[PDB]
Amino acid sequence: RELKTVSADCKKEAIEKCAQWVVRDCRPFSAVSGSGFIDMIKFFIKVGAEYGEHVNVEELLPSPITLSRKVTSDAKEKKALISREIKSAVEKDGASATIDLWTDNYIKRNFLGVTLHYHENNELRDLILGLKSLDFERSTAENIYKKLKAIFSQFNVEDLSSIKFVTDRGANVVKSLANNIRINCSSHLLSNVLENSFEETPELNMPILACKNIVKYFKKANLQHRLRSSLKSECPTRWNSTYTMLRSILDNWESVIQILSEAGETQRIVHINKSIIQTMVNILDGFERIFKELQTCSSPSLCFVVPSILKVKEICSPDVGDVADIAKLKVNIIKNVRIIWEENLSIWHYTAFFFYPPALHMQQEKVAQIKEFCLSKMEDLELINRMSSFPVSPSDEFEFYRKEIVILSEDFKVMEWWNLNSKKYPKLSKLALSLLSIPASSAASERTFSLAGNIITEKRNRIGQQTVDSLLFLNSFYKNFCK
Amino acid sequence: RELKTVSADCKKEAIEKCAQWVVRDCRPFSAVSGSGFIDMIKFFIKVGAEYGEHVNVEELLPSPITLSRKVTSDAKEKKALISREIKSAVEKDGASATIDLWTDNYIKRNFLGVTLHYHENNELRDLILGLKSLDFERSTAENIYKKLKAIFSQFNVEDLSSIKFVTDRGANVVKSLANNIRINCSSHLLSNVLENSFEETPELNMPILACKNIVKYFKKANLQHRLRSSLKSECPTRWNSTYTMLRSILDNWESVIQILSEAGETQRIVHINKSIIQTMVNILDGFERIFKELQTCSSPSLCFVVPSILKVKEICSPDVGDVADIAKLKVNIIKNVRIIWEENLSIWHYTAFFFYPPALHMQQEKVAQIKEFCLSKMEDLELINRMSSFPVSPSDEFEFYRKEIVILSEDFKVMEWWNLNSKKYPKLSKLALSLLSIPASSAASERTFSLAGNIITEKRNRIGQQTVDSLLFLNSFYKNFCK
DNA sequence: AGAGAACAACAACAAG
DNA sequence: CTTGTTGTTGTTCTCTGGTTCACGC
DNA sequence: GCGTGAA
DNA sequence: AGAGAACAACAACAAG
DNA sequence: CTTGTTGTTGTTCTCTGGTTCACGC
DNA sequence: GCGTGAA
Ligand code: NA
Ligand code: NA
């Protein structure tokens, strides 16, 4: 038990042999700190203890080709294993997924990613189900649904009606899922609000463009090195990138005026009304908070959609101290928040917010349809629960929730609040933690593309479609079912 | 001694624990096969044997930060060590270096790379001396020479007159080395011949451009997937890339006509006189042989410069069976080979070729200056050799070489031929293997940039200038002084 | 050339 | 014999040859 | 002073 | 958000 | 006390949100 | 049939 430490002169040879691994095999300094790398050294000291210090390393060490073939083998294994645990969630309603498409930068295979999302031991599960190519079929709806089913047939899922799907409004995607539950990613919606709002306020184009021309010049003249925080990409459309550049420009205002002065290029910054820039950055600062809040799948996010909208109605509260150009932006942004964000919300966004214990808010109209909604879902739990055998009624259990009060203490976790409430509310708290499992966005699947890209790289470019789907699910699995 | 193998059920857990390293820590399948990775497992089985199977892995395993600090520490160590072995070569004449500049794709620091080249135990040493930033000084000659000296002062080299330098004709570089021995990279020269030759034969622009428009369309329409050998980049100037595209296009002729036919885009290939394309590819095929021959620093290359030129005079031998457009190219190419390649050769390229045992060739004029050259260098050996103490004369030893004959057997290694000849020729064979050490090009330093780029990557982007210079020299060192 | 990666396609070989 | 599991070959894909110095008229 | 050349 | 990387700048701590 | 060697913090940099489907007039 | 929208 008591893991013995090693002599000082011994460990001087660990950092002597590790720093040789990294220079000879061109590997990252932080490979040594990897949760998988350590367990693989546990195994090699054990074997050393067993067979002594004169073992056939070559022979005993596997071959990359077989390592390739084992991940391919172990892939199917771990898929079958949870083939049951997954199958549970989809049956017992509370399973949500997010899908989107993505295309790699070397072969350019169209890819479809799927994740899955459910609640368990007072914790959330963001698991990467599949990432399969369409080889090169047209990205048509029916081909997508074709490959959607194939991911779920891997774990023996097949009704996929009880599944709540969360995607962007990509026309081809939207149609694929017209047969089942589909929730609109609120990050694309929010991004749509910004995009359309700033398009609709071209009074602000003059400041912005000039900023972009600053960044563009700093990149071209090889002088981002004199900044303590280099200036960011203009508008290659990374969600809220317009705030991003503006801040990095503002956060380096003094150094920039100085650098441009030395260049004699002072001409191209003086026309920038900084007063406005600043004002934009404060207004969008509130927004960036909502972006990160809604990219969370390790804590309930769906429920935070409605109150975010109110914060935006408030950042954009009309104020008689504003220059007309900002007045226009706030005017426009409240307009889009209505016709774009509100317009594409559903009773999954309200009900998720209803199950927030400060339930005082949505007192108006919405409870009459939420009650209609809430009742019919708890009824489908029982339906599928009676199939599992082979006073205190819900319509009142509802209003017993509506009478309670709570405070919003900074340590409050409404996810834990329902695990610690299932006794009095046995069948409603199973509905709640089912909705708190739904992610407010498809950012999960977005990270899968980030991850996928982390694998299929310059040197690793020969990598196969199956190798990638395996390696992803595995990594994802060894995170949801291991410590 | 007899390294014992492990049980079958034990190794099933090696490939069970290795395939977990690779999915959890997103690492290449071929990390398991790395010459540095194995020696680092040798150490961990040994320690397991010693302290048993219940060791504190965490505590004993180093920290990335320290791993960073050890490579930085061990860097200076290994630099001082060979501080002597290096210092030898530069003193004893037979040291050659290659330098060039390069700028990384994330910080864009101007970089200066240096390698060193000498002969020893019948083998060649391509060693990466330095890769240091100019931070952000102008890439001016005197700044370059400033940083040139700083690399050589690391190993306590300081006269750097006896050093033979090999670089491209970059104006700023060329001047830095105007004080010492500087040989023109024959790959840039050869590349200059192609470039200027094809510029000077615009009759061939019509076929070529149409090919480039083929590639450009295959990339844009996502249909390189139906090729068994995708079509290559048009003209982003990778040395002989014009042959490269042409071959990949030709090597997929039938599939391309078919793919374009399906697209209805048959219009954009039919005007390509394939007859010519083919002819270009045969002519440039000979050339690509010379490119790879001259990028070699693990075998003498300098000596193969002159005879290559003759092969080109021969690939381009005038032939009455040629369409005028190819006649023009060969006409132009013999013209540039003279005024570009020949024009920038020196008696280091002839003398290196003289020390090829089929010495019958260069019988004309050149021996009268080579004898003038050859004598004065063997005289400087003695000069520095007499300082090392603190009949059969050279002018005849010369012509004793000129009388011999040899055959060009396919297994002949003229590098080994001089190690097996030093007895009769004690002071001339030291001159020979000094010149056979000089690389015909700066391709060595080019690979260093390839290597450098392999380190400073997307995720590893924070990497420091010192970290990179270290990691390079180390990797380079553990290859020239280890088995 | 030099490096880094991955497979297809075998060939070997083994279990059944 | 058929399966299934390996190991080895060879084939394919990357990547650095890159934009501002120095000079002469 | 500006074009040319080579990277 | 989630992931991967690296340091500067400390703080700890130790040797001398 | 001064050195030198560590370990820990926090700050900075990456990266996926991406171009062709589906629809309606 | 072609524009518009959303990616
Ligand atoms: Na998409
Ligand atoms: Na260069």
The Cα B312–Cα B306 span in angstroms is: 10
Q: A103, A110 in Cβ contact below 8 A?
A: yes
Q: Which two tokens stand for residue A446?
A: 């977005």
Distance CA A327, CA A339 (A): 19
Q: What is the resolution of this structure in A?
A: 2.9
What count of other Cβ atoms lies within 10 Å of the Cβ of residue A453?
Answer: 14
Cβ–Cβ under 8 Å, residues B341 and B309? yes
* A43 with B17: Cβ contact below 8 A: yes
User: Cα A442 to chain center, whole Å?
Assistant: 6
The count of other CB atoms within 10 Å of the CB of residue A236 is 6
> Whose CA is closest to B46, among A49, A41, A43?
A49
Q: Which ligand is nearest to the CA of A185?
A: 1
Nearest-CA neighbor of B39 among A52, A58, A46, A47?
A: A58
Report which of B404, B395, B397, B426 is spatially closest to residue B358, judged by C-alpha positions.
B404
Q: Which of A113, A182, A126 is nearest to A437 (CA)?
A: A126
Question: 3-state secondary structure string, chain B?
Answer: CCCECCCHHHHHHHHHHHHHHHHHCCCCCCCCCCHHHHHHHHHHHHHHHHHCCCECHHHHCCCHHHHHHHHHHHHHHHHHHCHHHHHHHHHCCCEEEEEEEEECCCCCCEEEEEEEEEECCCCEEEEEEEEEECCCCCCCHHHHHHHHHHHHHHCCCCCCCCEEEEECCCHHHHHHCCCCEEEECHHHHHHHHHHHHHHCCHHHHHHHHHHHHHHHHHHHCCCCCCCCCCCCCCCCCCCCHHHHHHHHHHCCHHHHHHHHHHHCCHHHCCCCCHHHHHHHHHHHHHHHHHHHHHCCCCCCCHHHHHHHHHHHHHHCCCCCCCCHHHHHHHHHHHHHHHHHHHHHCCHHHHHHHHCCCCCCCCCCCHHHHHHHHHHHHHHHHHHHHHCCCCCCCHHHHHHHHHHCCCCCCCCCCHHHHHHCCCCCCCCCHHHHHHHCCCCCCCHHHHHHHHHHHHHCCCHHHHCCHHHHHHHHHHHHHHHHCCC
Compute chain B's Rg from CA coordinates.
27
Spatial CA neighbour of B276 closest among B200, B365, B201: B201
Q: Which strand E nucleotides have any atom less than 7 A from protein CB atoms?
A: 5-7
> Which residues interact with strand C by a CB < 7 Å criterion?
A 25-26, 64-65, 68, 459-464, 466-467; B 28-31, 34, 126, 292, 295-299, 443, 446-447, 450, 454, 479
Across the interface, whether the CB atoms of A52 and B13 are under 8 A apart is answered: no
Residue (of B373, B435, B374, B360) closest to B403 by Cα position: B360
> How many Cβ atoms are within 10 Å of B398's Cβ, its own excluded?
18
Q: What angle do CA B422, B425, B427 make, to 5 degrees?
A: 90
Is B58 assigned a ligand-binding role in the annotation?
Answer: no
Which two tokens mark A380? 């489908």
Token readout for B70 is 């050890």
Give chain A as a 3 state SS string. Answer: CCCECCCHHHHHHHHHHHHHHHHHCCCCCCCCCCHHHHHHHHHHHHHHHHHCCCECHHHHCCCHHHHHHHHHHHHHHHHHHCHHHHHHHHHCCCEEEEEEEEECCCCCCEEEEEEEEEECCCCEEEEEEEEEECCCCCCCHHHHHHHHHHHHHHCCCCCCCCEEEEECCCHHHHHHCCCCEEEECHHHHHHHHHHHHHHCCHHHHHHHHHHHHHHHHHHHCCCCCCCCCCCCCCCCCCCCHHHHHHHHHHCCHHHHHHHHHHHCCHHHCCCCCHHHHHHHHHHHHHHHHHHHHHCCCCCCCHHHHHHHHHHHHHHCCCCCCCCHHHHHHHHHHHHHHHHHHHHHCCHHHHHHHHCCCCCCCCCCCHHHHHHHHHHHHHHHHHHHHHCCCCCCCHHHHHHHHHHCCCCCCCCCCHHHHHHCCCCCCCCCHHHHHHHCCCCCCCHHHHHHHHHHHHHCCCHHHHCCHHHHHHHHHHHHHHHHCCC
B 127-186 residues, CB < 7 A, strand E: 168-171, 185
Going A289 to A291 to A293 to A295, the CA torsion angle's sign is negative
The CATH code of domain B1-62 reads 1.10.10.1070
B71 in Cβ contact with A19 (< 8 Å): yes
Tokens for B13, please give them.
Answer: 């857990």
In chain B, what is the straight-line distance between the N-terminal and C-terminal CA atoms, in Å? 18
Question: Residues followed by a break in chain B, C–N over 2.5 Å?
Answer: 390
Provide CATH 1.10.10.1070 ranges for chain A: 1-62
Locate A183 and state its tokens: 């929730």
Inter-residue contact B198 to B246 (CB < 8 Å): no
Task: Fill in the amino acid letter for B327.
Answer: A
Structure tokens at B181: 């021995």
Which residues of A carry a binding-site annotation for Ca(2+)? 100, 168
Looking at all shown ligands, the one closest to residue A112's CA atom is 1
Only one residue has tokens 């909208």, namely: A309
